[PDB]
RNA sequence: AGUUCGGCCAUCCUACGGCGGAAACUCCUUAACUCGUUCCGAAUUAAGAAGAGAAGCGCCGUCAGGCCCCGCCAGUACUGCGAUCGGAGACGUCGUGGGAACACGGGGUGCCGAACU
RNA sequence: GGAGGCCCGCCGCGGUGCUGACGCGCAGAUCGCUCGUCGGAGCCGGGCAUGGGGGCGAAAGACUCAUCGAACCGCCUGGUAGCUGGUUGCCUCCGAAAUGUCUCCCAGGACAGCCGCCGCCCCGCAGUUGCGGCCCGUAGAGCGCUGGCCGGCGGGAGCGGGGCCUCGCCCGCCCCCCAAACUCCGAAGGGCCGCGCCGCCCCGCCGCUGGCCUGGGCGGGGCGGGCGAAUGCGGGCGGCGCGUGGGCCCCUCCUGGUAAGCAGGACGGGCGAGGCGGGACGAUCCGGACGCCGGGCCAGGGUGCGCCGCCGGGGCCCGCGGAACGGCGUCGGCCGGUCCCGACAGCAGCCGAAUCGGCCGGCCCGGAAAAUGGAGCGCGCCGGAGCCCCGGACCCGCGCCCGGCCGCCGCGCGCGGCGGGUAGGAGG
RNA sequence: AAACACAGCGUCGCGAGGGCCGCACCCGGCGCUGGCGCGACGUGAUUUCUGCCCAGUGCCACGACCGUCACCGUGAAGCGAUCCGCCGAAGCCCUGGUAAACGGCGGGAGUAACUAUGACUCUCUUAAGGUAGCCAAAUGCCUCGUCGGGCAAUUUCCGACGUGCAUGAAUGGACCAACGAGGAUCCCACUGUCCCGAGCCGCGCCUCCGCGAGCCUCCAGCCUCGGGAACGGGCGAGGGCCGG
RNA sequence: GCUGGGGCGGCGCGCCUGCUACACCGGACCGCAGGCGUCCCACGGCGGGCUCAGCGAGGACGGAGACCUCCCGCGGAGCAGAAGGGCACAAGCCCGCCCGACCCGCGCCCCCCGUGCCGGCGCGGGCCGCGAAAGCGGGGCCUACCGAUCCUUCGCCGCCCCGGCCGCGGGCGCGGAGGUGGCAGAAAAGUUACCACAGGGAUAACUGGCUUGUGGCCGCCGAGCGCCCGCAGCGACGCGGCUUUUUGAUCCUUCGAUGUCGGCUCUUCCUACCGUCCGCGCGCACCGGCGCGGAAGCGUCGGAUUGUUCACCCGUUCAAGGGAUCGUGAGCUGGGUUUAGACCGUCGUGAGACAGGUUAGUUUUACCCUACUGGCCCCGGGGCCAGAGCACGGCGGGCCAGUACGA
């Protein structure tokens, strides 16, 4: 008793049913895989800037 | 059979072009890249480190990471009914800068220049919008015509 | 006969399947001679040419090719002498056909080699004949005799060219009366105008 | 004009003839020292200045091979969409869009940049 | 004289054959003929003994109260079942999947996809074209590379056959034909990205980077300018949960097979889960996708009569599924000859104008065969009621338009749009 | 029934403090027995016979203790739990016996004054290479083997033949008088088995008086072709048909 | 376990290359041609130097090849093993020094549910190798070469043994090794012809349907045969069709059952015609034969052996082929096939097996609807006719005549 092995017949219609979802607008600015030396320098420059430092007083 | 090794079905896309074998020219190493720049992906088959998968050949993306020897490129990939953002590391032999924005940059520059020019002289500003080809206008042509006929079989 | 009827392999249904390192145990074709008559004959003699064209897209077995060769050659040789014509078979049997011999039915039914056929398109010449004015009175009857061994529908034509060359008779004769022809054992070519001198 | 260092990597390559050197480059001379050759100062390392355009190099030529551009090939081959169009089939046709290749003919045969003489 | 697991034969004890009767029986095993044995390892009655994975067996897995390859009674026990059957009122709003991965998985499940309900937030969108950048090696083409394959003609250093000669191997040119696992070339077709903020000046921070007063990144402050393709149109996110996981058909493109209403794949559509008209007749073909009604217009298909609806004009003309191959059936062509200087058919005489050969096309004829009597739907028609073409009409699917009413969703609260549905979900 | 039993034949174990079996325990049977006995197996009257193989598996050694193989015991070390040695019953291993134990029992070449065959030679090879017999058998694939008998004519039957797919010696071989509701072939006699059917008797059936059920049941009950889950009563098109 | 039924066979049951695949990606088959479960302290890292295969010519104990020299040499060599890519002052060959074939911690790509596993890549620190230096180095140029929880064993540094302390011992946090190839990973031999259970037309064996390879029948062509003479009769090498009376292929309907071979009996139908009828042809004198067209009315038999269909033989008035659920079991029969008893041979340790042989083995129900055969539901005597049915074929003898014809 053999049954079907494979079909992609209806798959493109199912994909378009609710549109093709775009990624989130925060995935474009993640620090997920950035060079660590660059990230460390960015942190220290912000903290020492009086106009953008969040340190209290 | 059906096996899906990392480099399956690459007999033609990874081969070198005709009479373009050997080492790459040195311009591929001393050009400057910046964060946010658009680049193209083209695999070079003579360089086996930092090589992307066959799927990414012929796609365009932006730079998110500048490394000591490799770049980080963001690419949009469709998977079923959804788009995923993929981040890959590529060596310099497989990446070229992209001219997908050059037309827009030149249009912006020209628009600003023309806006400046007419203001100083006060001339009216023309239309700075692209037009899709409009139908032709009225005109007059001369006749020195040649009779055309259908030939025998 | 021991062979399937020719209707089982009439049409071009598969991709070309030549004999190579992948296909090995192939029997020898039935036809081995493709040039008959007076092959050695200067282009000067034998001015008239006839073609048996193909009006079908199909496959022709090597047995049919052998039969047609024998029939046409025998007739023309008997009627007008063995040295008045040159006959060329213009198609070769490069395609291999398979058989699934009949336990297991459709399971594992890939099939073994059996024979060879030629693949021909519409309008493609199948035979060509060169002759002088002596045998031109029977060339067409030889072609009609060979027409009955080939599947389908064929047409007989008389070419306007000179023999097997690419020149029309008018152009050939002019270029001969203007001294612009390099001559070979069968064919003629225009004189060269490029390369070094001397 | 030359040399050093480069960019693009044959319109720059290959073969065969010819022309040229003031300066430059080159070929050239020597083996104490330095370093060197499965053996060899051939190569390479060091030290020179009697010779030379004979090569390399720069330029010219060839009904030259190659490489490059334009035409023709040809709206042909093939093809997207529509057709109760023809045909037993194999295949073809019409409407509406896109559109080659080989072959052949004509012409061409390195520029660009920074420093010194 | 009278022995014998001797012989014929009655009652008894058995149970051969008719494969007889009966087979809703007289009967949950009987009846009739025929048959085996009949002093013996014979037959019959009563009492007693052996008990369930046990007994008993001249052995057939036989018998053990109509029950035996493991009795019967009650209880554990309403034992378990991915498997078969059934599962009870109405209306309204939405509405699938037959696919991917894993599974002692393949008649089942989990996770993902598709769908319903419940929400929440306020941040421009698109199964489209145009313009700009980049990617691919398929059809075709070809023989330069990797392979394959007919011959012709020239040169001979070297080598062989044969008679310093004559053909061969080798070198050159020319030439026939080729490739899913060949490619110097290469479409149609596809894919990805972009199409508003820009320009100038100055200032701050860095523990990164540079020979430096270099860079890069992140911020602040002033000046000028501005919304720079078309078309359409509001967008995004979360929670909980069901069904489904045997599919099939059409178009175009493929693979195995002689082929198949065969088996296996691909873009788009359909049936499933789509009413209605037509195709005589059909789940899928041609049109058209549905609340209840009145009127109008008309798609697809047709208009002798059954059976709603037709005429006019031009041409052809013996209607089975069907091939190679034949035809002097008729109509229409193309290319060649001969001909009043007399052709063709019966050099000259007789006549007195067309004729001869080849290659086709349209509609026909032959090739053309099966089993109950029968199907261009039937009856029939046939200078049509057949075939091809041109023109003007007609018939009818509430499909489309106009008007009335019902419900749902919206709303400048005046009105506007819409209405199919299996499995499944929700409201009254 | 050709199956089982059977007389006969053969093998094996046991001398009582034993053997075989029952059985939860206590206790039992053979056994009121004692080798001319009891128990366990195979073959299956008579006649004539019963060949070779102990490599495999099985069984047996009042054979041997080689190696291995327990607890216990004992020695050393340790704070102790422990650990390391020695010691070494049966069994296996080792050495022998046993086929009326289970079972098994060969290939290729050459060769004699016509041909043909092969008494004979060579060669590989086993634990041993199927002996006496028997056979197209209830056992032979090819096969309806070949020859003979019997018939007008025989895939049946009988007699021979034999490199026998895959016969064979108490898993018994060969033969056999008497016996058999056993399987098979032929001859005489006899006949409705048949050519080829005919006539008759009784009971049922059938009609009547009395009595009086079961099974089954979507609905219904005439055909041909088409299409359709590919063989329709219903559907499309035709042809027929009062009702009971 | 998969599986064009199951079994036997095979292993697309974990992975890799090229093709199938129709120019992004993806894409099936017990599709095609193949490969893997390894090998190497150098066959690894780095630096330097060099250029390979080979053509041509020359050197000669020396030859079709040893070794030497020059020339030109785009790779035609080599780089561990499949195939496809890549590589020339190199990724190849030779030489020198070395061990980055290291330690700590993160992220990404491929397959994909965007989970795991194998494999790869990019980084931040530590310590190193080579090189003048810039640089390069986490193995063998790239695409394959491998493995969870629980348990055991080993290694560094520490923590716990809960009334305390000390010494042994046990446990715990991190990382390796011991293995699951059916590779997301149970610990597992047969047989049932004494047999079951739940289901299945999701799936075989018998009818029917599509197909027609095979079987059967028929055309076209004309190399030849036929004393000579292609076609009286034949007809090679080839090519085109038809049929469903053979056998295959497939799995659409039927497993809450359509009684599965042959014979006997009885009816009807086909034609692709064997005898008889009517024509024509012959290599047709007569007799007898052979070929073709129309034609399905009648005929196509009795026996021996076999269950047989078939086959084979004897005989005769000389003896075609088929269909109808492979017509016909509430018509029979029961020889065969195909339950349960029993035997032989071969096979198996055995229970048992055998498209090998042999013998013995219950064949149930019509009263219902229709169809069919007859018969009824009264009406005078004698006739006619629509419609329906339908029935004379074959073989001899006598005369013609021992004639025509023929030696
Ligand atoms: K019991
Ligand atoms: K599954
Ligand atoms: K080539
Ligand atoms: K006995
Ligand atoms: K022994
Ligand atoms: K035997
Ligand atoms: K005889
Ligand atoms: K008996
Ligand atoms: K199947
Ligand atoms: K049995
Ligand atoms: K049947
Ligand atoms: K035919
Ligand atoms: K059934
Ligand atoms: K029967
Ligand atoms: Mg499935
Ligand atoms: Mg045939
Ligand atoms: Mg195929
Ligand atoms: Mg007595
Ligand atoms: Mg007696
Ligand atoms: Mg009876
Ligand atoms: Mg009865
Ligand atoms: Mg007991
Ligand atoms: Mg809806
Ligand atoms: Mg498992
Ligand atoms: Mg092609
Ligand atoms: Mg299911
Ligand atoms: Mg199908
Ligand atoms: Mg359904
Ligand atoms: Mg639908
Ligand atoms: Mg009407
Ligand atoms: Mg609705
Ligand atoms: Mg419902
Ligand atoms: Mg013997
Ligand atoms: Mg025998
Ligand atoms: Mg005998
Ligand atoms: Mg016998
Ligand atoms: Mg007899
Ligand atoms: Mg034996
Ligand atoms: Mg014996
Ligand atoms: Mg025996
Ligand atoms: Mg019915
Ligand atoms: Mg009806
Ligand atoms: Mg299975
Ligand atoms: Mg998998
Ligand atoms: Mg190097
Ligand atoms: Mg580091
Ligand atoms: Mg698994
Ligand atoms: Mg029935
Ligand atoms: Mg029944
Ligand atoms: Mg006929
Ligand atoms: Mg019946
Ligand atoms: Mg029987
Ligand atoms: Mg039996
Ligand atoms: Mg009646
Ligand atoms: Mg009548
Ligand atoms: Na007696
Ligand atoms: Na039994
Ligand atoms: Na119960
Ligand atoms: Na309809
Ligand atoms: Na006795
Ligand atoms: Na045995
Ligand atoms: Na891997
Ligand atoms: Na089925
Ligand atoms: Na049949
Ligand atoms: Na039957
Ligand atoms: Na019956
Ligand atoms: Na009655």
Residues ≥6 apart with Cβ < 8 Å to B115: B125, B128
Assess A35–B contact: CB distance below 8 Å, yes or no. yes
The β-bridge relationship of strands C154-158 and C48-54 is: antiparallel
Q: CA C62 from chain center: how many Å?
A: 11
Alpha-carbon gap, residue C139 to C161, rounded angstroms: 16
Distance A27 CA to E295 C1' (A): 63
Alpha-carbon gap, residue C138 to C144, rounded angstroms: 10
Alpha-carbon gap, residue C43 to C40, rounded angstroms: 9
Q: How many helices (H) and strands (E) does chain B have?
A: 1, 5
- In a mutational test of the A interface, the residue from B65, B68, B88 whose CB has the highest number of chain A CBs within 10 Å is B65
Chain breaks in chain C (C to N over 2.5 A) after: 102
Sheet holding C112-120, edge to edge: C58-61, C112-120, C95-99
- Tell me: is residue C14 an annotated ligand-binding position: yes
Shortest Cα–Cα distance, B52 to chain A (Å): 17
Nearest Cα to Cα of residue C77 among C32, C139, C124, C33: C139
Q: Are C85 and C138 in contact (CB under 8 A)?
A: no
Nearest Cα to Cα of residue B96 among B46, B40, B55, B37: B40
**A 3-32 residues with CB below 8 A of B?**
11, 14-23, 27-28, 32
SS3 of chain C: the string is CCCCCHHHHCCCCCCCCCCCCCCCCCCCCCCCCCEEECCCCCCCCCCEEEEEEECCCEEEEHHHHHHHHHHHHHHHHHHHCCCCEEEEECCCCCEEEEECCCCCCCCCCCCEEEEEEEEECCCCEEEEEEECCCHHHCHHHHHHHHHHHCCCCEEEEECCECCCCCCEHHHHHHHHCCCCEEECCCCEEECCCCCCCC
CA distances in angstroms from A47 to A35, A37, A39, listed in the order given? 19, 16, 13
Provide the angle, in degrees to the nearest 10, between the axes of the packed helices C62-80 and C139-146.
150
Structural biology method used: cryo-EM
- In a mutational test of the B interface, the residue from A32, A39, A41 whose CB has the highest number of chain B CBs within 10 Å is A32
- For residue C157 the two structure tokens come to 């034509």
**Helix (H) or strand (E) run with residue A15 in it:** helix A11-15
* A27 DSSP 8-state letter: T
B28 CB neighbours strand G below 7 A: no
Beta strands, E only, chain B: 38-41, 60-66, 70-78, 83-91, 95-97
* Residue C121 CB neighbours (<10 A): 10
SS3 B73: strand
Please judge whether B81 and A16 are an interchain contact, meaning their C-beta atoms are less than 8 angstroms apart: yes
Alpha-carbon gap, residue C66 to C88, rounded angstroms: 13
- For residue C98 the two structure tokens come to 């398979």
What's the C111 CA to ligand 58 centre distance in angstroms? 60
CA distances in angstroms from C141 to C52, C75, C76, C148, listed in the order given? 11, 9, 9, 12
């Amino acid at each position: 008793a053999k049954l079907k092995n494979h079909t992609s017949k209806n798959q493109n219609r199912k994909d378009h049913r609710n549109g093709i979802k775009k990624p989130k607008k925060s995935a474009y600015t993640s620090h997920k895989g950035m060079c660590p030396k660059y990230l460390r320098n960015l942190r220290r420059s912000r903290a020492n800037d009086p106009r953008q430092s969040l340190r209290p007083n | 059979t059906h096996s899906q090794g990392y480099r399956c079905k690459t007999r033609y896309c990874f081969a070198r072009k005709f009479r373009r074998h050997g080492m790459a020219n040195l311009t591929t190493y001393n050009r400057v890249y910046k964060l946010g720049q658009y680049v193209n992906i083209k695999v070079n088959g003579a360089y086996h480190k930092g090589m992307p998968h066959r799927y990414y050949n012929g796609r365009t993306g932006t730079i998110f990471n500048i490394g000591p020897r490799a770049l980080g490129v963001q690419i949009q990939k469709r998977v079923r009914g959804r788009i995923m953002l993929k981040r890959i590391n590529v060596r310099l032999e497989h990446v070229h800068p992209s001219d997908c924005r050059k037309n827009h940059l030149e249009r912006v520059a020209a628009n600003d220049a023309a806006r400046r020019l007419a203001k100083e002289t006060g001339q009216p500003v023309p239309c700075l919008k692209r037009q899709n080809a409009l139908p032709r206008a009225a005109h007059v042509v001369s006749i020195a015509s040649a009779i055309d006929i259908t030939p025998l079989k | 006969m021991g062979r399937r009827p020719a209707r089982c392999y009439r049409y071009q249904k598969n991709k070309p399947y030549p004999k190579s390192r992948f296909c090995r145990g192939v029997p020898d074709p039935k036809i081995r001679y493709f040039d008959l008559g007076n092959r050695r004959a200067k282009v000067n003699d034998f001015p008239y040419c006839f073609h048996l064209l193909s009006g079908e897209k199909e496959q022709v077995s090597s047995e049919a090719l052998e039969a047609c060769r024998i029939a046409c050659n025998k007739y023309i040789a008997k009627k007008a002498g063995k040295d008045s014509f040159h006959l060329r078979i213009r198609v070769h049997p490069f395609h291999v056909i398979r058989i699934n011999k009949m336990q297991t039915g459709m399971r594992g039914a890939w099939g073994k080699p059996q024979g060879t056929v030629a693949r021909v398109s519409i309008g493609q010449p199948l035979l060509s004949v060169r002759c002088r004015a002596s045998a031109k009175d029977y060339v067409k009857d030889a072609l009609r005799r060979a027409k009955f061994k080939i599947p389908g529908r064929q047409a007989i034509v008389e070419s306007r060219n000179w023999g097997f060359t690419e020149f029309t008779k008018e152009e050939y004769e002019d270029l001969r009366e203007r001294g612009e022809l390099q001559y070979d054992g069968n064919n003629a070519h225009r004189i060269s105008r490029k390369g070094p001198l001397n």
